[model samples]
Target chain A: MTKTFKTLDDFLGTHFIYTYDNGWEYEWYAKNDHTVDYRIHGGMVAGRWVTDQKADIVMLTEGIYKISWTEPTGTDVALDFMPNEKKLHGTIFFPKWVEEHPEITVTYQNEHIDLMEQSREKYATYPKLVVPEFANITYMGDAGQNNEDVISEAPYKEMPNDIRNGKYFDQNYHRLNK
Target chain B: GMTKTFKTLDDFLGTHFIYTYDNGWEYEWYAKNDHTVDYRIHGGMVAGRWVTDQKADIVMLTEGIYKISWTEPTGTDVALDFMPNEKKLHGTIFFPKWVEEHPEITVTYQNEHIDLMEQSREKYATYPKLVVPEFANITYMGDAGQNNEDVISEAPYKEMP
Candidate 1:
């Protein structure tokens, strides 16, 4: 079903997929700043899973500036990086498919549904998964030092003094703030 | 609603923190795979000394899949894939930005990264959130920046930890 957000704030974390007439798709999360983040392979590009591919595009006077690409492999493809252009012109190499494809088609739409949210909604029904406590709090010693034993015992409580209060811990740790 | 205690990695999706080690090398750790695993740690914060944010997806290890790594600028010169018992993401970062900055580092994440700091929440409290009308053009918010020059003009903007 199609949904509508009252403002851009509500739309901030929504995900969108760009579908080209040629069947190639680019999907990413919509950030509040008007840039798409963390792209996924909506479909195949030159017959390869466009896996781990992410990009940030900005609206310039020309077309769209490819501000960044997460996985930059193969040959570089040049584009207008502007708004008015209806086509993207560049050379991209797809190793498995062919050497390089010269041009790619483009299109735009106001997407209503968010696939990321949908994924979470689907997973919510399954058992409530809880990542074990202290899943991400790392305790590393001085460079070339091993603190595995120290970390395994109390990972959160025993962080380096310099970074304890740095946000990982509340206080009694490292304090570097105003 | 206010958040009590600190939010952990499970609290948010796609949160990342850029950390500088005592050795002066830097890396950005990203939490993905349902916020249950430390998905990646590409080089740099604002910009990588070796690789900028764009090409930072050098190494990514998912929970079930094998660990993977590659080289940039050279166009994925090295491709290594292996399954180990550790499950934890263990990898090495080769620095091209500086000759002596190479170090074998392990990346991890917590519920909150530099992004979710308490201070950052307050600092970005004034940013606007627009709800587009049905079938409305998505780019209208782009013009809102010109109207409200006092507010920050970028989405997914950065706040210091």
Candidate 2:
């Protein structure tokens, strides 16, 4: 099939080997410690990368309210990408002739974009953790699970409250480990 | 009594001292234990012109953003003098006491903006789509119990104020 998807929400948990303009299946992630790259894997989602994700520059589908890419070095890169830091409009895009735009940005503007409507997965750990494909992988691990086997060099264990929160949400928070 | 003169704040800073602007004189704070004159004058707004607008002396260097406070004669409004590049201020108005009292301020400054919505709906049409969009709904859908909005609509959604 041609490589266009319905929405960024649709791209959630799905990886693609292509650019996002074609649609959101592309697997974009840390290629290595040095450079960033995309992949065509099984499950990836839409979320902000605290560290810089360079490929966002090439994929401007329109109607993005803000697009800030923070460098791994702790500097903001894309502050001026949008107008007044608000979403781009549809009239400039979604013309009368263009019949089949995913309208992802349109949906987002109208509040028709529900990242968590049919599913409760996207909002699981947004601020704390970017929900991933497996739906269970954590940006941080629990004390016990964070043992030597899971992490070799890191000597510190989870903080007291972290241990509590992690264990409490372990059931629903993670797709794999709790 | 100890007395000395500095052409500018930079001169005092060159000696590893922070200076301040007082009723009309520049001052350098002295530690209680050290045996030296407590304060000094390096710069001032003489005849409405800055006297010690000079080169860098004891530059407060850093990596990120910061601010310098400035108060004009008539306006009580606090103005943030940005020093983003060096993280230090370079002017006659900036004084050690100011830095000592305030310590740190943000580097951002007020930018002028025009509210298009106030003008008219068509005003938004004049700008690029990336500039303005209708239906700016900010309510988070899933967080129902958390007091998020069911309907979020901001009129004249202000510009860069």
Candidate 3:
């Protein structure tokens, strides 16, 4: 059984390992059905990447995708990706911080692009929580689930009743806890 | 004695602050001008509650430099910065997406305690949404039940006054 997928379309619904030059690495589960799931191994203070950190990406074209989300670090991020040299190239944009111009980079590792069944089971549950759009860019928890486990944090639990009820639709508003 | 500066968060309330982007886009906002709380109603009942929930992305830094950033909720994070001084607030509003590299915009403030409730009542009647009784003007685009449509669907979505 031939396992390796040929083109970006063929690679849809597959698994791959992503390595950034900055030492941040993640196990990527590609869901062409819509979203992309990632489990980071290193490169952040939050320990290993959990299922809560998946991203929403739109396929601009074959082999090209755009990831739009607000980082927990209070950064509004827009990243683009395309295949290059048997790997993927990324272009990043940060609003209100560094680099007024778009940043270009080709230094990344997309190792072992294979079928979904070939992927591991632990991180497969990540994309199931995906919504059509983000309710709170800063919150990592599921939008509909507002249990104590999710809102137990400071700012969320401490949100003023007025502001909380006003922006209630923004489920992730509590993610701005810092 | 008339207040000369804004050194604390309370000094920001009941004032109108305006900023212009490098691209000539202008924005104006009034902070906590009225105590009359606003509500989001659904199915003939109030949906949510808030006092001064401005739709713009707001960031506060009270410890060092004492800065408040009001960024546009959508598109680029073009923001207006307010540095609290001992007597008055001071800071710059940057162009959309470009920060220090873009031309620095001067910030201005107006300390007027007007009846925000009256103003909102007048504005809400003209809006396509808001079927409420009176004074139902909300600060955010989404709060007005306009989330279904792209806030930038019209021209000058990113750079509007």
Who wins the TM-score comparison? 3
List lDDT for all candidates, in order.
0.25, 0.21, 0.29
lDDT: worst 10-residue window of model 3 chain B: B126-135
Candidate 3 on A8-97: residue-level lDDT in tens? 554444434444555444344444333444443433321222223334444433343444443322233333333322343222223222
lDDT of 3 by residue, B51-132 (tens): 1343332323332112232322112221223433322232232122221222121111101212432233222221111111
Per-residue lDDT tens digits for candidate 2, residues A52-150, read 243222112221111223222111222111121211111011111112222221111113224312222212211111111111111222222112122
Tell me the TM-score of model 2: 0.17
Best by DockQ: 3
Q: Give the candidates in order of lDDT, highest first.
A: 3, 1, 2
CAPRI grade, predicted model 1 = incorrect
Residue B146 lDDT (model 2)? 17
True contacts kept of each: 0.00, 0.00, 0.04
User: How many residue pairs collide in each prediction?
Assistant: 21, 12, 5
Comparing chain B with the reference, what is the TM-score for each candidate?
Answer: 0.26, 0.16, 0.30
Chain A only: list TM-scores of all candidates: 0.27, 0.19, 0.37
Best by lDDT: 3
**Tens-digit lDDT track of model 1 for B39-84:** 2333432232222222122222222222222333212211111112
Error of 2 at B19 (Å): 29
